[PDB]
Amino acid sequence: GPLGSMEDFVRQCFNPMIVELAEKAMKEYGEDPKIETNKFAAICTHLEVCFMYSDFHFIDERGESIIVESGDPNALLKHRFEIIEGRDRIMAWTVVNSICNTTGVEKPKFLPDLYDYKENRFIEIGVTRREVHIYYLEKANKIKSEKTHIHIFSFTGEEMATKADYTLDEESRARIKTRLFTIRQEMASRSLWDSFRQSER
């Protein structure tokens, strides 16, 4: 089939908000999205998974975690997750500080992705084109804050999470895995997948 461009794939297949956030992140880190294109797509994918992980999850009036998939959460519901990823450096650390000196949870050494108000912990999300165990170990060896919970998704449906604690219900994680499948399938249709997979390194 014809080889498409990754740029076209990213612009067509991700919400413009996600794409803009990804471009902003690459700029902050001195990366060119028109050159490291596989990285660009990976950044978009990771941001989308961070958002999907938080979507629909609230803390109810009694303090219990609940799922609301309708458009209107009742006014008293509180979002279960704080999203750190997607924020510029100053704001991300600002949020992390606000959570920490507040909830009493200690301050991480690297910016995590999410904070979970039900489980009272930061979360590092990962999305890998490689084996989940290898990637889990890479993440873990990097941070070892060891209050930070790690949850890795792959494009083939495998997951690995700290202490075999997966945080979310099966259906929430199935939504993420379905999206990852869809991304893989669409990139493959455009003859972009093999190279994207091999680029992770």
Q: Which of 113, 116, 124, 177 is catalytic?
A: 113
CB closer to Mn ion out of 159 and 188 = 159
Decide if 85 is catalytic: yes
What is the edge-to-edge ordering of all strands in the sheet holding 78-79?
65-67, 57-59, 78-79
| Residue 97-136 contact track with Mn ion, rule CB under 5 A, x = bound | ----------------x-----------x-----------
Query: Which has the closest alpha carbon to 156: 186, 132, 189, 172?
Result: 132
| Residue 59-88 contact track with Mn ion, rule CB under 5 A, x = bound | --------------------------x---
CB closer to Mn ion out of 10 and 21 = 21
- Asked if 23 is part of the footprint of Mn ion (rule: CB under 5 A), the reply reads no
Between CA 111 and CA 185 the distance in angstroms is 31
Please give the sequence-ordered ranges of beta strands (E in DSSP) within 37-155, or none if there are none: 57-59, 65-67, 78-79, 81-83, 114-116, 121-128, 149-154
Q: Which of 23, 48, 82, 85 is catalytic?
A: 85
In angstroms, give the least distance from the CB of 2 to Mn ion. 33
Structure tokens at 64: 């219990």
Decide if 139 is catalytic: yes
Decide if 8 is catalytic: no
In three-state secondary structure terms, 149 is strand
Helix (H) or strand (E) holding 50: helix 37-54
In angstroms, give the least distance from the CB of 110 to Mn ion. 8
| Residue 142-171 contact track with Mn ion, rule CB under 5 A, x = bound | ------------------------------
Between CA 96 and CA 87 the distance in angstroms is 11
Positions annotated as catalytic residues are: 85, 113, 139
Binding-site ranges for Mn ion (CB under 5 A): 85, 113, 125
